[PDB]
Write a protein that binds this ligand. Structure first.
Ligand SMILES: Cc1cc2nc3c(=O)[nH]c(=O)nc-3n(C[C@H](O)[C@H](O)[C@H](O)COP(=O)(O)O)c2cc1C
Ligand SMILES: Cc1cc2nc3c(=O)[nH]c(=O)nc-3n(C[C@H](O)[C@H](O)[C@H](O)COP(=O)(O)O)c2cc1C
Lengths: 368, 375
């Protein structure tokens, strides 16, 4: 089983290729990592396995879900350290994903009820819903388009949070630049209508992610930075007129950061749409992952719809070096050992993805 | 087995609940029903079974796939007549689906290379593609928003086409009001941005489908008219802000049409929404749990008459739908492509042939069309 062949991810010696994908779970009450997170990541940790945390706030403005952890305060750092220590005692490697939602927030999640910040003043459409703190669903408001200087302060929030993640003991960080959140609000020409130097051209639209990655590379080293994008996922109205060309532009800039710095990023991580969908429609079904992998010099993590079989095929055929798993890792704490043994996998319950119970739907999925 | 209890679809006594879902197959070269269509439908016909044809053009502007049949000319009527004959000879009931694609077309499919027509001037976005005549995937262009007063001319196209269909011997017609096509482009508030009497309110957005159904009911009789909608479908950018309320508003208008005509429609046919697409994201499923759970039954319970569910059904799922009361009839698409004798295979609980998507829309009169094997 090629999923259980070792992989050197820069300095990190992984014993298998099964990765915990980053998953918001909303158990970090009051934006403070709670003991339950320690239990949850401990359950999924394996010797030489790679974990990526749920998306984690870089600033007071970065949240658009309830009870999601931050790492922008010393208080947050201290509680994360207890979690990281427990993961490290099992021999796991763990990265903190740094998450700014940009316009995918709501006044209830913002200081002083200020407008969420974004590349644009355009709101997510009423297609989509935000999870409100009462468990109801709400409507995304109009964001405020941030100015040129402000963009550098947000870059600084990523830099300082990466330092905070090293202070907590994390092995590294991941830049959440996917799924229509703040970085993707700059990348996607369906969102970014700026007419300053961050908008228009492909090169301009990649400035923001290039600045973020470069700042965190300078702070903690490239080999402790992974970068996650999703050029073909249009979640939260995040469409690009040309996903292949946007993805290649990002890849070229990541390669260039590596060449300029003289170092290798931990990895590029790309989420794919589930192409099994729309099979029942007339035109719904009428190369990309692998083109991006081919163009990228370094470690590639694929994600989105993967199964044991699909993961095995991805590694064996060289589409990816590592395979991250989300929903199946929610319901299978011992996912790695089940994949190793080909044991049947527990079903997952969407209803408790985002609830606050520290046990139910969180740590009470059974082991083999 | 509840799938094989009989059912009175109004005028038509059916011997079982397994229905051939309408499926575009692009074998009707140059929009003429071909002899291949006769063999294909005859293969799937059973005594007392119901078939719905592939979407069929109502006018020169109504197509957005290659080699789909029309029924807007008497030459087409003559050729359909022969296909209907061989289906009737096997004791099946067959409806012709009247399909206008609206903006889901391309200049190559339009007379004189003109713009496709729609409720709006907004094109389907770049995330969707059209099948070109050569089998490449092309870009949906900018449509022309039809005038307030030309809407009645398209309504007339449905009327004349419905009369042609029954003239060919069809037991009736189904209005394709689903999947982002012309009717749905008036229905869905993600598409219909009109400022006239056909846009804005929910009432206004239902005007087009109401007038289409009332014209065909008036021409051919209510019990020969089926109506297909898909309030909750991700296809060709056909989003509505409130799918359950859109669906209920449409049902209400059909109930009203039935009360005024004094007779029930043949059925309401509803495509089940799918929820695979965004299950992998952070927020993609968030406003949709209640719709997944209950949209289909709620529409069914609201409608005075026969309900056909469609979308993802299997033998087990189809049995449950009927046993549970969620549907009266269950339509199958892709399993019917690959199993000419699907009804018998479902009856006997036999193995089912796999379907090959690569030959769904090719022009071959045999390969991937009539050469799937019987038991
Ligand atoms: C409940 C849930 C929470 C998620 N939270 C995040 C997140 O915080 N950051 C992120 O980049 N992706 C997030 N994702 C996407 C996953 O990291 C991953 O790409 C996806 O689950 C992989 O597809 P799979 O579930 O089929 O394995 C989340 C997905 C789910 C289902
Ligand atoms: C190749 C193909 C062609 C289709 N053409 C039509 C059509 O012309 N009219 C329509 O209303 N639905 C059409 N559909 C949707 C089907 O009628 C039906 O709703 C769907 O196939 C049911 O799901 P199933 O395939 O899982 O049984 C088509 C589906 C496919 C796969």
């Amino acid at each position: 089983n090629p999923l259980f062949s070792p992989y050197k991810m820069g300095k990190f010696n992984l014993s298998h290729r099964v990765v915990l994908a980053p998953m918001t779970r909303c158990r970090a009450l009051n934006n403070i990592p709670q003991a339950a997170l320690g239990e949850y990541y401990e359950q999924r940790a394996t010797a030489g396995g790679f974990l990526i945390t749920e998306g984690t706030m870089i600033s007071p403005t970065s949240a658009g879900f309830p009870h999601v952890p931050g790492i922008f305060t010393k208080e947050q750092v201290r509680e994360w350290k207890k979690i990281v220590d427990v993961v490290h005692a099992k021999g796991a490697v763990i990265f903190c994903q740094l998450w700014h939602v940009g316009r995918a927030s709501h006044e209830v999640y913002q200081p002083a009820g200020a407008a969420p910040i974004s590349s644009t003043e355009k709101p997510i459409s009423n297609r989509w819903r935000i999870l409100m703190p009462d468990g109801t669903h709400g409507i995304y408001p109009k964001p405020r388009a941030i100015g040129t200087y402000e963009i550098s302060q947000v870059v600084e929030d990523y830099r300082r949070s990466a330092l905070n993640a090293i202070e907590a003991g994390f092995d590294g960080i991941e830049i959440h630049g996917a799924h229509g959140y703040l970085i993707d609000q700059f990348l996607k020409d369906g969102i970014n209508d700026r007419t300053d130097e961050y908008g228009g051209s492909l090169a301009n639209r990649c400035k923001f992610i290039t600045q973020v990655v470069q700042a965190v590379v300078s702070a903690i080293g490239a080999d402790r930075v992974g970068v996650r994008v999703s050029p073909a996922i249009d979640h939260l109205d995040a469409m690009d007129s040309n996903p292949l060309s946007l993805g290649l532009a990002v890849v070229e800039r990541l390669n260039k950061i590596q060449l300029h710095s003289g170092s290798k990023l931990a990895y590029l991580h790309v989420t794919q749409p589930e192409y099994v969908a729309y099979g029942q429609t007339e035109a719904g079904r009428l190369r990309l992952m692998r083109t991006l992998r081919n163009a990228y010099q370094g470690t590639f993590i694929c994600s989105g719809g993967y199964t044991r079989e699909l993961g095995i095929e991805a590694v064996a055929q060289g589409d990816a070096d590592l395979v991250s798993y989300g929903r199946l890792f929610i319901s299978n704490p011992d996912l790695v050992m089940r994949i190793k043994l080909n044991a049947p996998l527990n079903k997952y319950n969407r209803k408790t993805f985002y609830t606050q119970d520290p046990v139910v739907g969180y740590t009470d999925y059974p082991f083999l």
